[PDB]
Amino acid sequence: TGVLTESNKKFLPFQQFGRDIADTTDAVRDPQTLEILDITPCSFGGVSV
Amino acid sequence: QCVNLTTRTQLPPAYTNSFTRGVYYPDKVFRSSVLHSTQDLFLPFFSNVTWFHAIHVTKRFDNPVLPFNDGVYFASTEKSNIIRGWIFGTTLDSKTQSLLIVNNATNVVIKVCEFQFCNDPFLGVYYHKNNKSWMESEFRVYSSANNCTFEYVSQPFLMDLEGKQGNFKNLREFVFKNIDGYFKIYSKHTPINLVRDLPQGFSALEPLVDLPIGINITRFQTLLALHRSYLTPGDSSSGWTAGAAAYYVGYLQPRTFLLKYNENGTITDAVDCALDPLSETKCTL
Amino acid sequence: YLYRLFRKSNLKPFERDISTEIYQAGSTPCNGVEGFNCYFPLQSYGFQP
Ligand SMILES: C=CC1=C(C)/C(=C/c2[nH]c(/C=C3N=C(/C=C4\NC(=O)C(C)=C4C=C)C(C)=C\3CCC(=O)O)c(CCC(=O)O)c2C)NC1=O
Ligand SMILES: *[C@@H]1O[C@H](CO)[C@@H](O[C@@H]2O[C@H](CO)[C@@H](O)[C@H](O)[C@H]2NC(C)=O)[C@H](O)[C@H]1NC(C)=O
Ligand SMILES: *[C@@H]1O[C@H](CO)[C@@H](O)[C@H](O)[C@H]1NC(C)=O
Ligand SMILES: *[C@@H]1O[C@H](CO)[C@@H](O)[C@H](O)[C@H]1NC(C)=O
Ligand SMILES: *[C@@H]1O[C@H](CO)[C@@H](O)[C@H](O)[C@H]1NC(C)=O
Ligand SMILES: *[C@@H]1O[C@H](CO)[C@@H](O)[C@H](O)[C@H]1NC(C)=O
Ligand SMILES: *[C@@H]1O[C@H](CO)[C@@H](O)[C@H](O)[C@H]1NC(C)=O
């Protein structure tokens, strides 16, 4: 679950998933239209009351 | 059929220093700007790599049956494509299956098959006088083939198999391993202009194939090529010459490595852990 | 339908072995022939209905 946005990554032909330092997936390649998308959370962060 | 080769000149085995060579990608995941650590079968840095080469000048034809000690790093320096494949297997004498990888100038072919091999397998490049054209005329690898399980033939292609005089223009690096019945091959194809020994540099190998052969492999051999022409006198056993080409063979070992990925996802540098204390400290920190 | 009854060592994962050389059960090599203390390794299932 998350927000999917367009991005700019030079994926190699044999790769489809990209992982950051935390090892969670961050970059995906759409199977239909061979573009690259970036996944971000949808709780942005600090909300103090 | 196959013909034993006679014109030879033995020399002590050549040795070379393999430094910062034999590093391949560990997986197929896009990691960028991350220093990742891993342990696998790796070629140790600054190892002593065995060296064979074919030069006419002697005639120095060398392609023995080498052990496949749980992985092999094969690196060839060539200018005319004298090295044209590999054989893998245990007995190589039709009692066990064997793997054959061959570039026969039209298709690259991979076969897992109970080959009955010859003592000195090779291929014949020939040169003609009606036109100044080199071509491949002979295929003297195996006498017979049966019970022939795996088989792949690539698309047709045309390649310049001519004899080129001068500096070695192409380095082709290959890592072979046999893990869980899968023959994993990693490749790197880079132009150079050096002639003596391994280039001073660093290149990370990419994953090529992942062949499902399911074969026990302990020994392997290289398939070289012979120029034959009117200049070369004698029968098929002696009427030949070998162009200038070289290859190096280093044995993989289980080691720990540190790898650095740039922003575009490719490897830029690596550290062989447990080489020297400085590298050991880089590895720990 | 045949199964390999004898082998000098266990298979590695996803490894095939279709050799038919005679298995030297005894300590005396029987140089490629059958007989006593060395057996043909492949034995045939008998599947009666
Ligand atoms: C035998 C197995 C074999 C393999 C595994 C192989 C792989 C291979 N060949 C390539 C190109 C190429 N490969 C060759 C020729 C060869 N390349 C070799 O590994 C060998 C041994 C020869 C010839 C004997 C040539 C001529 C090209 C075109 C690029 C160039 O001419 O420099 C490439 C890179 C193409 C690219 O960047 O998209 C690979 C990975 N070719 C083969 O024949
Ligand atoms: C793969 O092939 C090798 C070579 O035949 C096998 O190793 C040999 O096995 C026999 C019988 O156990 C021994 O006598 C030899 O000493 C072994 N030689 C070496 C270099 O190890 C090996 O057993 C085979 N692997 C499998 C899974 O069958
Ligand atoms: C010579 O060739 C024959 C068959 O062609 C082969 O049996 C023999 O092993 C070969 N000997 C050498 C030294 O190559
Ligand atoms: C290979 O290199 C190392 C270090 O240079 C050396 O100790 C070793 O003797 C060399 N191998 C041979 C067979 O001499
Ligand atoms: C060798 O090249 C020829 C000509 O293209 C081709 O027919 C053949 O398939 C190649 N060898 C093998 C074993 O396929
Ligand atoms: C292996 O080859 C021989 C003769 O070609 C044949 O009798 C035998 O059935 C074959 N076995 C397999 C598994 O192909
Ligand atoms: C990464 O790719 C971009 C695409 O042009 C290129 O400009 C840049 O030089 C590359 N970065 C490195 C370190 O090679």
Side-chain angles (χ1 to χ4, degrees), chain B residues 95 97 114 147 149 180-182 213-216, chain C residues 7 9 12-21:
Chain B
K95 294 185 187 178
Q97 304 218 92
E114 283 206 349
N147 297 359
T149 68
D180 279 3
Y182 283 79
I213 62 163
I215 303 306
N216 182 14
Chain C
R7 218 180 166 279
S9 48
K12 303 304 208 65
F14 292 138
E15 174 190 352
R16 211 172 293 98
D17 184 33
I18 56 169
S19 63
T20 51
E21 56 86 19

PDB file of all heavy atoms in Angstrom, chain B residues 95 97 114 147 149 180-182 213-216, chain C residues 7 9 12-21:
ATOM      1  N   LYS B  95      30.901 -41.625 -20.830  1.00  0.00           N
ATOM      2  CA  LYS B  95      30.301 -42.330 -19.708  1.00  0.00           C
ATOM      3  C   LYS B  95      29.451 -41.418 -18.840  1.00  0.00           C
ATOM      4  O   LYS B  95      28.564 -41.907 -18.133  1.00  0.00           O
ATOM      5  CB  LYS B  95      31.397 -42.963 -18.846  1.00  0.00           C
ATOM      6  CG  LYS B  95      32.166 -44.069 -19.544  1.00  0.00           C
ATOM      7  CD  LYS B  95      33.160 -44.733 -18.607  1.00  0.00           C
ATOM      8  CE  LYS B  95      34.053 -45.712 -19.350  1.00  0.00           C
ATOM      9  NZ  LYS B  95      35.060 -46.344 -18.453  1.00  0.00           N
ATOM     10  N   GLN B  97      27.481 -37.292 -18.737  1.00  0.00           N
ATOM     11  CA  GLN B  97      27.075 -36.132 -19.511  1.00  0.00           C
ATOM     12  C   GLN B  97      28.159 -35.064 -19.468  1.00  0.00           C
ATOM     13  O   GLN B  97      28.972 -35.001 -18.543  1.00  0.00           O
ATOM     14  CB  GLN B  97      25.771 -35.556 -18.970  1.00  0.00           C
ATOM     15  CG  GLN B  97      24.632 -36.535 -18.914  1.00  0.00           C
ATOM     16  CD  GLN B  97      23.320 -35.892 -19.278  1.00  0.00           C
ATOM     17  OE1 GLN B  97      22.917 -35.894 -20.439  1.00  0.00           O
ATOM     18  NE2 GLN B  97      22.642 -35.332 -18.286  1.00  0.00           N
ATOM     19  N   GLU B 114      25.843 -36.499 -23.816  1.00  0.00           N
ATOM     20  CA  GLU B 114      26.868 -37.503 -23.521  1.00  0.00           C
ATOM     21  C   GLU B 114      27.861 -37.550 -24.683  1.00  0.00           C
ATOM     22  O   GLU B 114      27.878 -38.467 -25.505  1.00  0.00           O
ATOM     23  CB  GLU B 114      26.246 -38.870 -23.268  1.00  0.00           C
ATOM     24  CG  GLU B 114      25.605 -39.031 -21.895  1.00  0.00           C
ATOM     25  CD  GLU B 114      25.563 -40.475 -21.420  1.00  0.00           C
ATOM     26  OE1 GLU B 114      25.844 -41.389 -22.223  1.00  0.00           O
ATOM     27  OE2 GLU B 114      25.242 -40.698 -20.234  1.00  0.00           O
ATOM     28  N   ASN B 147      22.020 -39.374 -26.277  1.00  0.00           N
ATOM     29  CA  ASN B 147      21.334 -39.161 -24.999  1.00  0.00           C
ATOM     30  C   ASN B 147      21.476 -37.706 -24.560  1.00  0.00           C
ATOM     31  O   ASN B 147      22.085 -37.385 -23.540  1.00  0.00           O
ATOM     32  CB  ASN B 147      21.860 -40.113 -23.927  1.00  0.00           C
ATOM     33  CG  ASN B 147      21.603 -41.559 -24.269  1.00  0.00           C
ATOM     34  OD1 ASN B 147      21.019 -41.862 -25.306  1.00  0.00           O
ATOM     35  ND2 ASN B 147      22.026 -42.462 -23.397  1.00  0.00           N
ATOM     36  N   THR B 149      20.466 -34.152 -23.698  1.00  0.00           N
ATOM     37  CA  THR B 149      19.337 -33.604 -22.946  1.00  0.00           C
ATOM     38  C   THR B 149      19.102 -32.124 -23.232  1.00  0.00           C
ATOM     39  O   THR B 149      18.073 -31.755 -23.805  1.00  0.00           O
ATOM     40  CB  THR B 149      19.553 -33.817 -21.444  1.00  0.00           C
ATOM     41  OG1 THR B 149      20.652 -33.017 -20.997  1.00  0.00           O
ATOM     42  CG2 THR B 149      19.823 -35.280 -21.133  1.00  0.00           C
ATOM     43  N   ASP B 180      23.708 -25.863  -7.278  1.00  0.00           N
ATOM     44  CA  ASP B 180      22.380 -26.470  -7.148  1.00  0.00           C
ATOM     45  C   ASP B 180      21.835 -26.900  -8.509  1.00  0.00           C
ATOM     46  O   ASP B 180      20.675 -26.662  -8.846  1.00  0.00           O
ATOM     47  CB  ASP B 180      21.407 -25.516  -6.440  1.00  0.00           C
ATOM     48  CG  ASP B 180      21.559 -25.535  -4.927  1.00  0.00           C
ATOM     49  OD1 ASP B 180      22.447 -26.246  -4.411  1.00  0.00           O
ATOM     50  OD2 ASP B 180      20.782 -24.832  -4.250  1.00  0.00           O
ATOM     51  N   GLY B 181      22.685 -27.538  -9.306  1.00  0.00           N
ATOM     52  CA  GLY B 181      22.280 -28.009 -10.610  1.00  0.00           C
ATOM     53  C   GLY B 181      22.116 -26.936 -11.659  1.00  0.00           C
ATOM     54  O   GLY B 181      21.707 -27.255 -12.780  1.00  0.00           O
ATOM     55  N   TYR B 182      22.420 -25.681 -11.338  1.00  0.00           N
ATOM     56  CA  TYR B 182      22.322 -24.563 -12.265  1.00  0.00           C
ATOM     57  C   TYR B 182      23.723 -24.079 -12.597  1.00  0.00           C
ATOM     58  O   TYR B 182      24.511 -23.781 -11.695  1.00  0.00           O
ATOM     59  CB  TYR B 182      21.505 -23.417 -11.675  1.00  0.00           C
ATOM     60  CG  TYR B 182      20.016 -23.654 -11.698  1.00  0.00           C
ATOM     61  CD1 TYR B 182      19.415 -24.473 -10.757  1.00  0.00           C
ATOM     62  CD2 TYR B 182      19.211 -23.056 -12.651  1.00  0.00           C
ATOM     63  CE1 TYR B 182      18.056 -24.694 -10.766  1.00  0.00           C
ATOM     64  CE2 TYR B 182      17.850 -23.265 -12.666  1.00  0.00           C
ATOM     65  CZ  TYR B 182      17.278 -24.093 -11.725  1.00  0.00           C
ATOM     66  OH  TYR B 182      15.920 -24.314 -11.731  1.00  0.00           O
ATOM     67  N   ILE B 213      21.289 -27.227 -16.145  1.00  0.00           N
ATOM     68  CA  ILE B 213      21.907 -28.409 -16.738  1.00  0.00           C
ATOM     69  C   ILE B 213      21.874 -29.626 -15.810  1.00  0.00           C
ATOM     70  O   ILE B 213      21.762 -30.758 -16.289  1.00  0.00           O
ATOM     71  CB  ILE B 213      23.350 -28.073 -17.164  1.00  0.00           C
ATOM     72  CG1 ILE B 213      24.244 -27.673 -15.983  1.00  0.00           C
ATOM     73  CG2 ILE B 213      23.342 -26.919 -18.162  1.00  0.00           C
ATOM     74  CD1 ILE B 213      25.710 -27.734 -16.314  1.00  0.00           C
ATOM     75  N   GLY B 214      21.959 -29.423 -14.499  1.00  0.00           N
ATOM     76  CA  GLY B 214      21.923 -30.519 -13.549  1.00  0.00           C
ATOM     77  C   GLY B 214      23.047 -31.519 -13.727  1.00  0.00           C
ATOM     78  O   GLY B 214      22.802 -32.728 -13.711  1.00  0.00           O
ATOM     79  N   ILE B 215      24.278 -31.033 -13.878  1.00  0.00           N
ATOM     80  CA  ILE B 215      25.436 -31.858 -14.210  1.00  0.00           C
ATOM     81  C   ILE B 215      26.486 -31.717 -13.120  1.00  0.00           C
ATOM     82  O   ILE B 215      26.691 -30.627 -12.576  1.00  0.00           O
ATOM     83  CB  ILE B 215      26.032 -31.487 -15.587  1.00  0.00           C
ATOM     84  CG1 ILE B 215      24.976 -31.600 -16.693  1.00  0.00           C
ATOM     85  CG2 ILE B 215      27.240 -32.359 -15.911  1.00  0.00           C
ATOM     86  CD1 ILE B 215      24.267 -32.952 -16.769  1.00  0.00           C
ATOM     87  N   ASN B 216      27.138 -32.829 -12.798  1.00  0.00           N
ATOM     88  CA  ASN B 216      28.330 -32.809 -11.967  1.00  0.00           C
ATOM     89  C   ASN B 216      29.525 -32.425 -12.828  1.00  0.00           C
ATOM     90  O   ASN B 216      29.764 -33.038 -13.871  1.00  0.00           O
ATOM     91  CB  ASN B 216      28.544 -34.183 -11.334  1.00  0.00           C
ATOM     92  CG  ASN B 216      29.741 -34.234 -10.409  1.00  0.00           C
ATOM     93  OD1 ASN B 216      30.283 -33.206 -10.012  1.00  0.00           O
ATOM     94  ND2 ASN B 216      30.154 -35.446 -10.056  1.00  0.00           N
TER      95      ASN B 216
ATOM     96  N   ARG C   7      24.795 -45.846  -6.036  1.00  0.00           N
ATOM     97  CA  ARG C   7      25.628 -44.712  -6.397  1.00  0.00           C
ATOM     98  C   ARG C   7      26.709 -44.558  -5.342  1.00  0.00           C
ATOM     99  O   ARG C   7      26.510 -44.905  -4.176  1.00  0.00           O
ATOM    100  CB  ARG C   7      24.813 -43.424  -6.512  1.00  0.00           C
ATOM    101  CG  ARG C   7      25.254 -42.526  -7.647  1.00  0.00           C
ATOM    102  CD  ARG C   7      24.412 -41.275  -7.721  1.00  0.00           C
ATOM    103  NE  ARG C   7      25.021 -40.270  -8.585  1.00  0.00           N
ATOM    104  CZ  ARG C   7      25.992 -39.443  -8.224  1.00  0.00           C
ATOM    105  NH1 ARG C   7      26.518 -39.471  -7.010  1.00  0.00           N
ATOM    106  NH2 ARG C   7      26.449 -38.558  -9.105  1.00  0.00           N
ATOM    107  N   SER C   9      27.931 -41.754  -4.217  1.00  0.00           N
ATOM    108  CA  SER C   9      27.640 -40.634  -3.338  1.00  0.00           C
ATOM    109  C   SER C   9      26.279 -40.066  -3.705  1.00  0.00           C
ATOM    110  O   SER C   9      25.760 -40.299  -4.798  1.00  0.00           O
ATOM    111  CB  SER C   9      28.718 -39.552  -3.432  1.00  0.00           C
ATOM    112  OG  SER C   9      29.013 -39.250  -4.783  1.00  0.00           O
ATOM    113  N   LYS C  12      23.643 -33.968  -5.680  1.00  0.00           N
ATOM    114  CA  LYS C  12      23.399 -32.588  -5.307  1.00  0.00           C
ATOM    115  C   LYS C  12      21.993 -32.192  -5.743  1.00  0.00           C
ATOM    116  O   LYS C  12      21.371 -32.892  -6.542  1.00  0.00           O
ATOM    117  CB  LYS C  12      24.429 -31.666  -5.949  1.00  0.00           C
ATOM    118  CG  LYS C  12      25.878 -32.001  -5.633  1.00  0.00           C
ATOM    119  CD  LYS C  12      26.156 -32.030  -4.138  1.00  0.00           C
ATOM    120  CE  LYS C  12      27.604 -31.692  -3.812  1.00  0.00           C
ATOM    121  NZ  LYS C  12      27.973 -30.292  -4.162  1.00  0.00           N
ATOM    122  N   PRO C  13      21.448 -31.099  -5.202  1.00  0.00           N
ATOM    123  CA  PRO C  13      20.088 -30.704  -5.583  1.00  0.00           C
ATOM    124  C   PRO C  13      19.955 -30.456  -7.077  1.00  0.00           C
ATOM    125  O   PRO C  13      20.835 -29.865  -7.707  1.00  0.00           O
ATOM    126  CB  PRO C  13      19.865 -29.418  -4.787  1.00  0.00           C
ATOM    127  CG  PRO C  13      20.724 -29.559  -3.612  1.00  0.00           C
ATOM    128  CD  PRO C  13      21.942 -30.288  -4.075  1.00  0.00           C
ATOM    129  N   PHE C  14      18.825 -30.902  -7.630  1.00  0.00           N
ATOM    130  CA  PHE C  14      18.466 -30.680  -9.032  1.00  0.00           C
ATOM    131  C   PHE C  14      19.579 -31.133  -9.970  1.00  0.00           C
ATOM    132  O   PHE C  14      19.889 -30.478 -10.965  1.00  0.00           O
ATOM    133  CB  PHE C  14      18.122 -29.206  -9.278  1.00  0.00           C
ATOM    134  CG  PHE C  14      16.848 -28.746  -8.617  1.00  0.00           C
ATOM    135  CD1 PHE C  14      16.805 -27.515  -7.994  1.00  0.00           C
ATOM    136  CD2 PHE C  14      15.708 -29.529  -8.606  1.00  0.00           C
ATOM    137  CE1 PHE C  14      15.659 -27.076  -7.381  1.00  0.00           C
ATOM    138  CE2 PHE C  14      14.560 -29.094  -7.994  1.00  0.00           C
ATOM    139  CZ  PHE C  14      14.534 -27.866  -7.381  1.00  0.00           C
ATOM    140  N   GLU C  15      20.178 -32.276  -9.651  1.00  0.00           N
ATOM    141  CA  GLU C  15      21.249 -32.863 -10.441  1.00  0.00           C
ATOM    142  C   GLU C  15      20.745 -34.156 -11.062  1.00  0.00           C
ATOM    143  O   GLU C  15      20.093 -34.963 -10.395  1.00  0.00           O
ATOM    144  CB  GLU C  15      22.486 -33.123  -9.571  1.00  0.00           C
ATOM    145  CG  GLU C  15      23.643 -33.868 -10.248  1.00  0.00           C
ATOM    146  CD  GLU C  15      24.712 -34.293  -9.264  1.00  0.00           C
ATOM    147  OE1 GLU C  15      24.641 -33.880  -8.090  1.00  0.00           O
ATOM    148  OE2 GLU C  15      25.620 -35.050  -9.663  1.00  0.00           O
ATOM    149  N   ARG C  16      21.054 -34.340 -12.340  1.00  0.00           N
ATOM    150  CA  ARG C  16      20.735 -35.552 -13.075  1.00  0.00           C
ATOM    151  C   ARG C  16      21.973 -36.427 -13.197  1.00  0.00           C
ATOM    152  O   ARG C  16      23.104 -35.935 -13.197  1.00  0.00           O
ATOM    153  CB  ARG C  16      20.201 -35.211 -14.465  1.00  0.00           C
ATOM    154  CG  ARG C  16      19.201 -36.209 -15.014  1.00  0.00           C
ATOM    155  CD  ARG C  16      18.569 -35.722 -16.303  1.00  0.00           C
ATOM    156  NE  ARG C  16      17.712 -34.560 -16.093  1.00  0.00           N
ATOM    157  CZ  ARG C  16      18.057 -33.292 -16.287  1.00  0.00           C
ATOM    158  NH1 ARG C  16      19.271 -32.949 -16.687  1.00  0.00           N
ATOM    159  NH2 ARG C  16      17.160 -32.337 -16.062  1.00  0.00           N
ATOM    160  N   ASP C  17      21.748 -37.734 -13.296  1.00  0.00           N
ATOM    161  CA  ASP C  17      22.844 -38.693 -13.420  1.00  0.00           C
ATOM    162  C   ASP C  17      22.329 -39.882 -14.220  1.00  0.00           C
ATOM    163  O   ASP C  17      21.681 -40.770 -13.658  1.00  0.00           O
ATOM    164  CB  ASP C  17      23.351 -39.119 -12.052  1.00  0.00           C
ATOM    165  CG  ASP C  17      24.550 -40.039 -12.137  1.00  0.00           C
ATOM    166  OD1 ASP C  17      25.353 -39.888 -13.080  1.00  0.00           O
ATOM    167  OD2 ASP C  17      24.690 -40.916 -11.259  1.00  0.00           O
ATOM    168  N   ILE C  18      22.637 -39.904 -15.514  1.00  0.00           N
ATOM    169  CA  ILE C  18      22.139 -40.925 -16.427  1.00  0.00           C
ATOM    170  C   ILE C  18      23.264 -41.848 -16.892  1.00  0.00           C
ATOM    171  O   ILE C  18      23.165 -42.458 -17.953  1.00  0.00           O
ATOM    172  CB  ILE C  18      21.399 -40.296 -17.621  1.00  0.00           C
ATOM    173  CG1 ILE C  18      22.287 -39.300 -18.371  1.00  0.00           C
ATOM    174  CG2 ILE C  18      20.138 -39.599 -17.144  1.00  0.00           C
ATOM    175  CD1 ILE C  18      21.704 -38.855 -19.694  1.00  0.00           C
ATOM    176  N   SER C  19      24.337 -41.956 -16.113  1.00  0.00           N
ATOM    177  CA  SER C  19      25.391 -42.908 -16.420  1.00  0.00           C
ATOM    178  C   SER C  19      24.935 -44.324 -16.094  1.00  0.00           C
ATOM    179  O   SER C  19      24.115 -44.544 -15.199  1.00  0.00           O
ATOM    180  CB  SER C  19      26.657 -42.575 -15.637  1.00  0.00           C
ATOM    181  OG  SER C  19      26.439 -42.691 -14.243  1.00  0.00           O
ATOM    182  N   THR C  20      25.481 -45.290 -16.835  1.00  0.00           N
ATOM    183  CA  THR C  20      25.100 -46.694 -16.724  1.00  0.00           C
ATOM    184  C   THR C  20      26.300 -47.592 -16.442  1.00  0.00           C
ATOM    185  O   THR C  20      26.211 -48.811 -16.617  1.00  0.00           O
ATOM    186  CB  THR C  20      24.390 -47.152 -17.999  1.00  0.00           C
ATOM    187  OG1 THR C  20      25.180 -46.800 -19.140  1.00  0.00           O
ATOM    188  CG2 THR C  20      23.026 -46.493 -18.115  1.00  0.00           C
ATOM    189  N   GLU C  21      27.422 -47.020 -16.012  1.00  0.00           N
ATOM    190  CA  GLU C  21      28.591 -47.823 -15.682  1.00  0.00           C
ATOM    191  C   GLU C  21      28.287 -48.741 -14.503  1.00  0.00           C
ATOM    192  O   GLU C  21      27.479 -48.422 -13.629  1.00  0.00           O
ATOM    193  CB  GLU C  21      29.792 -46.925 -15.363  1.00  0.00           C
ATOM    194  CG  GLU C  21      29.582 -45.880 -14.246  1.00  0.00           C
ATOM    195  CD  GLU C  21      29.839 -46.414 -12.844  1.00  0.00           C
ATOM    196  OE1 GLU C  21      30.510 -47.456 -12.700  1.00  0.00           O
ATOM    197  OE2 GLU C  21      29.363 -45.782 -11.877  1.00  0.00           O
TER     198      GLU C  21
END
